[model samples]
Target chain A: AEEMDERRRQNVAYEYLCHLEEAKRWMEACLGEDLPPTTELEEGLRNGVYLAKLGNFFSPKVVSLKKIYDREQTRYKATGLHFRHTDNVIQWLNAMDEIGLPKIFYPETTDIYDRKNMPRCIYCIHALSLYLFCLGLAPQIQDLYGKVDFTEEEINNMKTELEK
Target chain B: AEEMDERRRQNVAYEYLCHLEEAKRWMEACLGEDLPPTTELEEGLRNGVYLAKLGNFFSPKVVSLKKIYDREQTRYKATGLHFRHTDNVIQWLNAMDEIGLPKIFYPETTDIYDRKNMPRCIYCIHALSLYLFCLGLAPQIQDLYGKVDFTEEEINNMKTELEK
Candidate 1:
């Protein structure tokens, strides 16, 4: 039973790595910033700084940048790091809510900072990317999770619905 | 053990149904023919007639329609039906080869007619759809299997390589 559980976890990790690569590409395109070759997805995104940036990128000022803590500020203690990370995640989640994105796929703070469920985190990112693409705020991302072909009229109708 | 196997098969069938719905829409768009609501994927595609038409639609005359047996012709005997079905599949495969599509995802005859591996068959169709899209012969299909974001320059390079 333990062996099966380990194999399943390994499979999920492999899948997460694939999503991470695609998410990296999407972020680079949206942020116009190149990620360093040494950047690992979990390490890079654990503090939620990038996620907050992404939320604000699509909806300017939706995530207040001032609330996000710098890496150095959280460097002293483990507990302090968790608090800061959770704060940034909350800010990002609030941005998403304000942007009128559905909450169906949103991940919790622990899902990201604690690495409790990396796939859910990536799914949330992919959902954000798709929503922004529909809103014409981002370029089209291929193989996006939960991707659907939305017509121009359909997009307009959705925009109207959101506005209402 | 048997229950687990049955549940796994049910999961695959559900997945196949989703792919079938998308494939139907793609085929209708490509063929300019409406599939009746009564049409079931396995039964409708078992004879490979539509697959051949799709191949030729992308690369005209790549699949000879004259070699395809109609549904009425294959209604006599089970053994003869298998032979005709296999023949059509072979013709479709040849057309794919002539059109310079990679053979990486092609499914065998039994995979379709016998329902031995419906997911593999759908994967092969999705691969073909992506190839045709790159060749500028088909519309963009959303959430395609094994989808990758290809730049225009990359598509052009691929076209050039295929022509070589």
Candidate 2:
């Protein structure tokens, strides 16, 4: 994980974005609008949502972070999020480790999210804990505030609200 | 989501904990230590070691309190942790409507042990967004450190460290 962390993970992500562009081309060439938000028909239940978020928020081009995490290849997987989280599950996991838990968590996915399974009498932050896993996984990609896919009128309305 | 206050939420969680305690007993009884550390054993990457620290230092007790968001149900599920993590995973799916990232972060959990496939970003405390969730689920559980399932040696060691 340290070696992967030392590398330019973003550059690696860029390479992934390249593949996503290809995938999107297939989608645009054939799938079109009503293309089923990546969460559902696309098997969005697990990996699709996370990948969609990278593009929705960070860069529309880099929407593949989800697949990166989901992919069988380790390079595509972003371990930093697990080691830490956009939400904070990792921080709590660390505390569990301080005493002992990850050494015990299941699927090697780090069982911190299942506070019910891993009851922390002292340090279980369930919401922030759960959210940490949620955000870190980048599942809420569909809800970014500043959406670009909208028209000038739609964008204008959102901007107007911000200005107000 | 905010149908109740922090104190009330804790009271409810206290109520749930009793059920959870029974659930934990069932989990240990059935799985015991046989649950195979993490879920990666199927991948043929079997190493007794995990991604973090190691040793008998690990007591891998499945935790409690995290609810998997269920977008389909539009409500948090019964699974809070490993007792039925799939249920917890469901609660997380639904949580997208309530708040954003974590306030404390899951690294709080990761600080303890290491495991495979665990993302580091699980530790981002972006804001106090998950406050209600945490207040409802955790009961400032961090305060109970060392009191939970501690051994005579572990308990004594914790006390000795506290005085420091």
Candidate 3:
């Protein structure tokens, strides 16, 4: 009976991607500061551009990507850790917002294929070489939204990546 | 040309709701540190929990809600606010998440002449009251879900209370 009761309290998706603080921080950063343009890859991230920018902020895989981004200096953060324009954190955020990385990295889309398209994936040598970054563990990644194209090697790599 | 592009940039519901962060914090306060004990009330908050919680960490709404709960007076910072135990806050958040205020304050019942059946309305008070108190907004004392049963006077009274 006790075990059953405990089980009853269990959540449907206990491990469902939970990243409120990170989203809040990103929102605060974006709302207060203008979204800046990254290098040639993305255009300028401007003020009041919430959709394309905001969507990326809420993506579930940003944490791992950021860890990798932070561990080694990528061209992405040549100016600083979070932002871009000549040390202006706000400008850097603008650039990130434009790249679609923020939304793809968090809970917004749990699909593995979707996450692979992150801006960092386009920029970072490590992300390109890695399998799905942190996206494999997410439940929806396997059931992809039905649009992504994957190969046997890629799918196997994703499975191996998640097991790690 | 800029105007057409600008028009395309915005949506029908631009910042459709300003309370996203405020709503998130109010729910968090109710849930406590490890996340609230899940219940039927959790359905609405699922998105906020998995997506928004870990993403970022700041917002005007977050700041506003914090000011209410951060009062150093009692267990809940002794805000003496109208909020019920933190769990109640979670319940209200569920409502917000499920339908948002537009739906909560103005429900979508196929039937209109059913005032007595609207007791279901009172159930959300604990959550809504707490959310309002924390953000320095007032309790919704009337004008329920736009039930046909309510008198215009009653709705007016509720709006008046909100002003406080």
Candidate 4:
């Protein structure tokens, strides 16, 4: 039981670290100046002072969602690294719009195949929901979307809306 | 005719100025040091000595294609500025691979959007070809790919292969 708890904590920490790194990059791109390195982010997570500075400086919800997709992509691309559970998969997507980061699709497509081609929020929701359902991961929703403070009914409603 | 020629010359100069700016950024990114200001690039373009030093110091093909896309984007974005012909549209893309610069899309998408999405040659071809068709700009081939020394037959062959 203790080992399982530790593992869960590790997984949680891993996810946060990924977000913090992304947050650092997002902040760097938007602010035109570097904040303290991402190494400082953990201290921020642990210490209230750090969190305040980070929060005040950046929007957790306004994160550029591309980083999330790209991160999952790297894992998907690797020979061994893979997400076995759909529960493990959707948080990054959830974090995009759910946690305050409004997902972005640049309005302009520089060229035809500007894969930002799927530039709308609806398209993003549609694509991710389809993938989850395709993988039979829809029933596993609680594991990913649970922490959002939404009742199960809300999640179900979202699932229905996204699928449609 | 002379006026038209002069206008064409002027456009060429502006585009070169843009490239020089991009080249400065590219060199900075690659070398971790700034190149002389872009004014020097104009002088270099004129004086072979400048061109030689510039070439020796950098890989022109490995340019930051984001700058190319971003420039065209301003026109696409503004209610006022717009590319009237596919002719105007292709020069930036042309200079990408055909001229001193080769195009690029990084293999991995890092958090910064890295703006390096279109990192190198294959992506350059893949993206430009896809765009050319989507815009019905293939028939308007002379606008961009025409000058690449590839025949009409060659371009069509490429178009067919990419579509397939």
Best by TM-score: 1
What digit string (tens of lDDT, one per residue) describes model 2 on residues B1-164? 56565444444333332322322332233233322222122121112121111111122222222222232222312332222223332233224223433222333222222223222212121112233334442111122222234234433433333233
Model 1 stretches with alpha carbons more than 4 Å out: A1-164, B1-15, B36-39, B71-80, B142-164
lDDT of 2 by residue, A49-149 (tens): 23233222323343333433333323324442232231233222333344322221221122323322222211232332243343352231122122224
Residue pairs clashing, model 1: none
Expressed as tens digits, the lDDT of each residue in B110-151 for candidate 1 is 777665765556656766665666567798545422332334
Per-residue lDDT for A8-98 in model 4, tens only? 4444334333333444454444434555554443222221222222222333553333333333334433543223322222333343334
Question: For model 2, what is the error of residue A27's alpha carbon versus the real structure, in angstroms, after optimal superposition?
Answer: 42
Error of 4 at B153 (Å): 1.2
In candidate 3, what are the lDDT values of residues B42-139, reduced to their tens digit?
Answer: 23332222212221122223323332322222443233323333323343344454432212222112111122222123223233433343344442
Candidates ranked by TM-score, best first? 1, 2, 3, 4
DockQ of 1: 0.03
DockQ of each: 0.03, 0.05, 0.03, 0.01
Model 3 alpha-carbon drift over 4 Å, by segment: A1-144, A162-164, B1-164
Worst-scoring 10-residue span by lDDT in model 4 chain B: B103-112
Clashes of each: 0, 95, 42, 12
Best by lDDT: 1
lDDT of each residue in A1-164, candidate 1, tens digit only: 76995554444344344455667788888877774331256556777777777766876676765666763334523443456677777788888888765454467888888867655676667666656665678986544223323344443443343233
TM of each candidate vs. truth? 0.40, 0.20, 0.19, 0.18
In model 2, state the lDDT of residue B106.
33
